[model samples]
Structures are given as C-alpha cells and as structure tokens.
Target: KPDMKIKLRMEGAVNGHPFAIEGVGLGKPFEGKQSMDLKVKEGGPLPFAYDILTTVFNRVFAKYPENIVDYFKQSFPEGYSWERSMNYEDGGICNATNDITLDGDCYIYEIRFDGVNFPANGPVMQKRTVKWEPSTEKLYVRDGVLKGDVNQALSLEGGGHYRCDFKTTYKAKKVVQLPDYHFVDHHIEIKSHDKDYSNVNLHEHAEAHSGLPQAMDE
Candidate 1:
C-alpha cells in the first residue's frame, strides 16, 4: 500500500515512428489527483416514488496506468529497442545510442548526417555533422548546447560535391533544452506569428455620412 505507485520509463516505436517517454510519475500513481467523479440522476427511483426515496449513485473514473500499461503494451509492444533516434528529412539524423547512462540520464547522441546535401540556394552547398550530448534532470530535460562543424563533401578524385569546407563549430551563449523531445522525423521551420492575411477595407459610409448614393441603389 505504501509502495503501490512507482515512476515510469517507457521507450518504443508506435506505428512506424519511435519515441522515448520518461517521467517522475506517469503511471497510476496519480489516480487520486488525476481522476474524475461522475454522478447519475437516472439512478433515482421513478417520480411516483417518495421524493425522499429518490436516489443516485456516484461513480469514480480514473486512470489505472497499471492496467492501462497492459493495453499500452499491446499497442506499444515495448518496441524493438532503443535504437530509435531523431531524424530530419532534409536535415539528416540524430542517432541515439542503445546504451543509456544512469549517471544523470546520459547518452551522447551522435547527431550526424550520413551523406546529406544541404538545400541552400548556392552554387556551393554546405554539409555538417551535429552532435548532442545533453543531460536529463529531474523529470525533464536539463538542456545543453549543440555543437557541429561543417566541411566540404567533395571527393579528391570525383569532386561531385564541393571543393572548400565551411569551418564552423558552435556553442551558444550557453544553452539547454532537450530538442529531441518529439517522435517525428522531418524538416520543419518553427516560426513566430507568421501567416498570410487579406482584409477588406471597403464599406459604405455610416448613417452620419453618405459617400455613394448611386452605390446604395446599385
């Protein structure tokens, strides 16, 4: 009873995509706090019965993650393994290793691209390798900086790629936020309040004024 609830750590692939889920308390440990109660008036006797005889029942509705985990495992199947990493369609891949470090939730994600061609509009394309070795703190990510270096992918004999390298490695002013929190693989641009709009400013004059009399008739 005292040790009934426990923390949860689940990692696997759903559908064809992969995901990793870890939390302090994602299981049924939160039944009391994360539950709902329902009451049914239909439980009362017919109106012909005494009003005092009127009755109803209260129902409890809550998630028993212990039980749900059973069905979740049916859908999740504990996955093939933890070899699943993050990937970007145009950007490349962030390969997470199978080994997980208990020391502060650690695994140096080899965020590298195999042989990707940057889609920048330039005669000379750029290529780079990205790596993320961040920390996992508490029930969430502690975050960290991402660093990478770009270089030429041209071959000495074929030269099908570029000839010069773009030397750049990065460490932000200082950074943190486990960017790999999602389970999707694709190139997406995160924008801020960006969209297209069209507003019509044409309208008839108010009752205080008249601008187009013939227009009103029209």
Candidate 2:
C-alpha cells in the first residue's frame, strides 16, 4: 500500500454541459516540471528547444509584421511622407497645346490650381494627381471618367477655377512604402480640456511601455 496519495479535480462546462474530472496520483519524486512557454528571464539559454524556438520566432516575426507597430517600421515618418512638398515643387501650368490619354500605368503629380487666375491658396495648393490609377482592389481610372475640365474643381470666392484645356505633367516623387495610418473612433476624445488644458499624450501607447516610436529620434 502507498504511504500517501493526492487527489486532482477539475469541474467545468462544455457548451452548457456541466462536467467534472478527478484523478489520483502516487506522490513520488518525478520530473522537475517547467513551463513550455518561452519566458524571458535575467538571460541565458537553458532548454535547447526553448532557445531554438525563441531564436526562430524572433527572425520569423521580424519579417512578417504582426501588429500596428511592426507595420509602422515599413513607412517613413508622417511629416516626411505625407506633407505636400513634392507636389508644390513640380506644380506648373500647361498652356501650350498638348496631348490627352496620359500613360495609364505611369503615375504623375498634377496639381489642381486655376489656369486663368491663381487662388488665395496659391498655385501650389494641396492636391492629388488625376491619373490612371489602376489597382486590383478598385480601378478608379478604369471605372470613372478621368477627364477633367473642372477641378480648382470649385469656383472660388474670387472666381478662380481650373481650366480643362491645360494642366501640369510633373512626375510623382516617390516616397517608398508609405504605410496607411488609421484613427478608429472609440468616443475617446483625444483633445485638451478648457480648465487646465489637460491633454492625453497621443503617443501614450508607446510612451512608458516602449519609446522607439516615441523617440522621434528624441
């Protein structure tokens, strides 16, 4: 007969069905049990499988982005890429006779400013190119009429409007791998209050937790 024994039990439900599991074990010296998860300790390798697992995971995850932070690495800073610098530099008026049916696949940076009289925003206002942007997701050029006689496309207070007759043909300066940033509304008003002008650090997510994105080269 055994000198001592242990009882094990677990009670739960499976799809609303109640159940219980019970077991008894011979209390005796056995394996020193350790967790299977890859945990970070003070540092040094122990289990060969754990070391290999973590090493492989690091390299694998480095290639395939798993979170928003990972994808952030793919893009340049928002100020660097999103600002309308290139569009301003290349913007100009096309008055002399030219051709239509622009190269469909090839991209261009056509600024939408008035040909007759420049608006208050000036000639180099913020504008996206009117080109044959063909994508598998939704081909706008293929679907909508790319023809434009109208895009200062608005008649301004000063009566300035873009001419359909002529336009610019400047090439798009490429800012590589510009990743999309999205702001989802949670009724979380990220703003300042009137009293103390209290504010939420927009980058709070990466502030104390991690600050690589927070660094800003800071």
Candidate 3:
C-alpha cells in the first residue's frame, strides 16, 4: 500500500468534551477524502474552525493564563466537558439576581446571585465576553434561561435550587440559518464531589470552568 499514508491530528472544544484526532490517511494530492469533519490544512479553513488549537493555548494565557494553565492541569486529565463542569452551584441561596449583557461579538455580564458576588477574573469569568455564531460548530455565547424563576421557585416551596440553561449553535461565519442557536431548559444539580454537601454553591467544581445560566426571550 504505497499510496496509503497515515496522518496525525488534534482537536478541542470551547465548552465541553475535549477530544484528540487519531491517525488518518491522506492519499495523493487531488485524491482526498470528505466526511462530516474538515482536515484544516488540506481542506482550507473548514468553515470557522480555529487553525491554532494546540498553539492557541497562548490565547487563554495572553491575558489570563494562570487559571487557564491550572485548569488544564486537571481538565487535561479528564479531557474537558465533564459532569462536574456542568454544575453551576452546590446550594444555599435564593431570590438572587444576575445581569448578563451582550455587545456586538462580546458577551458580558454582572452576576449577583442569592447575594453572592462574583468578581472579574481576566476573560475567564470576570469582564469576560465571547463571540459565538451558531453556524460552524465553533464557540459562541447566547441567552441561557428561557423561562421560569429557578431561584424564586427554590426559595418558595422548597424545590429546584438551581437553574441552568443551554444554547447550542453552529459556529458559521456568515448567513443566518434562522434557528441557529437552540436553547434547552435544564435544572442544576450537584452530583459526586469531594464535599458532596447540598450547599456548596459554585465552589465545588474546578476553578477554570464556571458557567452561569443566562436569560433569554422566547
């Protein structure tokens, strides 16, 4: 099989589930292969996918590298996107208010949940913003909560302590696919942690990854 050659590739995600690219075959020049994924170099830009994945490590550090580095210290082992990473809070608190604002391509927010204050920690959590176009499987941010007052409900009848929302979008450069970003209503729960107490809040999960639910309009 003289024409059969193997190639190595690496991959990642902005939100969850970090994976690697195994050995692939690249035949002759014009003789290429096509699948759901793009090979980058051979396939030009492959929509909005970032060219520098492994090299992009410096991006997170360019301004706030300390936490990013520490996060990778542990997340690198679990690969990214773990059940622990999804949990926003452990417990304790009610009738909290968090304000999240978006400007142009940047998404910023000021959170004040259940009287718990969160400060800006570089672009990771504080003074942070992200651009997510629901088109190309890239990273983008959008409105989180679509309905219901999770905090209020929890304090009243003693149920549903946390509220988490999900927004899924394809990272495309241009063109409005109409329903680009889709929202999912999810309830937050703290499952399997060192403390495992029903009152941890957002401290149980690893440092680098802490995502709060956003408000959206249906």
Candidate 4:
C-alpha cells in the first residue's frame, strides 16, 4: 500500500465574509494522487465564530428541514451555557445568559440579553440562538483546494423577527503544505530510458563507503 502524509494551511470566507483554518492530514494515496480522502484523526476545531456558525444552519434545514432542531440537540450531551451582565441608565443593571449544545455535528448556541435599557426601559430582554456545522472532504491536493460543507441557523427569541439562516457549499483554498517528519535515509536505484536500472547491494558498498581510515587506506 502507498503511504501518504499531507500538510495544509487553509483560509477562505463564507458568504463573502472571511474565516481561516489550518491543519494536516495523513492517508493512503487515492484517486490517482490528484486528491486524497482523509479523516480528522487529530487536528482542528476549525476556529470559527457565531456569524459563521449560524450561516450554515440553513443547509442543515434544507438537507433535513423537518425535525432539524431535534437533530441539533442530540449532537451534544450535557448542553452548554454562559451568562453576562450589563449596566443601565436608571442606576440598575441587566443580565443575560446563553445556553446551547450540539444538534448534530453543528453547534446549537443561544444567547439571551437581559439588561436595563437606560432611560427608555427599566428592564429589557432579548434571546437568540443558532445552529451550525462545518466539514471538509475530497481534498484536491494538486489544485490546492478542498470541498467543504456548512449548515447553519439563526433564531430570535421573540416572534422570530430577527432571524436569517442559510447554508454554504464551496471550496477552500490551500495556502500551504508542510511536513512534520525528520530526515531519514532511503535507497533508490537509478533508471534508464527503458525503465530498467542497475541494482547495487548496500552491504557490497558498505566497506567501500565506510569512513574508517583502514577501509580508506585499503
């Protein structure tokens, strides 16, 4: 079997907005070496943000729209949540919290903003959540890009007025490929025009190639 290792640095945008990712992969050579089918053995959480995440939810729904919310919950167990506070003009304060989990391969994140709105309102509250997933496949090493898929959703707590969701399917550019291996000695036979070559035994050449003074003198 042919062994292969590919290192890649990637950067691109979703919906004209930019995002960056870098990672390496190891796999068997495939599709005549024009491409590789690698797995996420180790490397990357993709380092993305909320806007990027929600944009992908539209895809999850279009692909499996019905019961999609249920799919998002099952992807993560134990769920996730966070809280933060803000100041108000009426000498009071407001607090907000976020609770989310994985609803499939995508992250289902929700944030609530509840704080004093200063002179206007003594107290105000807003809630929003989104589900998103990003994945890559079919790396075209030679072309320096890989096929990618994104699914995302954005939902506002009240009446769903501030909501927008969509999906992205595109190619990500490969900016770099680097190796992590150190040098190792390997032998290769020289070939002629006809694809035939002369073979030399390493043991036979060992004495001649050795650096010992006596071996050199003889």
RMSD of each: 29.0, 29.8, 20.7, 26.3
Q: Which ten residues in a row have the lowest lDDT in candidate 4?
A: 199-208
Instruction: Please give the distance, in angstroms, between residue 197's alpha carbon in candidate 4 and its true position after superposition.
Output: 72
lDDT of 3 by residue, 1-218 (tens): 21223233434332332333322322221122111121333322221122112111100111112322222112211122111011124321112222222233221222221211122331222212222111111122334211211111112122222322222221222222222222212222222222212111110101121233353334
Best by lDDT: 4
What residue pairs clash in candidate 2, if any at all?
A: 215-218
Clashes of 1: 3
Per-residue alpha-carbon lDDT of model 2 for 46-118, expressed as tens digits? 2111110110110001122232222222221221111111111223332221111112221111211112222
Q: Give me the displacement of residue 123 in model 2, in angstroms.
A: 32
Candidate 1 TM-score over all chains jointly: 0.18
Best by TM-score: 4
Expressed as tens digits, the lDDT of each residue in 46-137 for candidate 1 is 11111000001000112223312211112111111122233333443233322211112211111211212324532212222111111111
lDDT of each: 0.20, 0.19, 0.21, 0.24
- What total of clashing residue pairs does each candidate reach? 3, 1, 15, 10
Better of 1 and 2 by TM-score: 1
True-structure RMSD for candidate 2: 29.8
Off by over 4 Å in 2: 1-72, 77-79, 83-174, 178-188, 196-218
Tell me the TM-score of each prediction against the true structure.
0.18, 0.15, 0.18, 0.20
Q: What value does the lDDT take at residue 41 in candidate 3?
A: 30
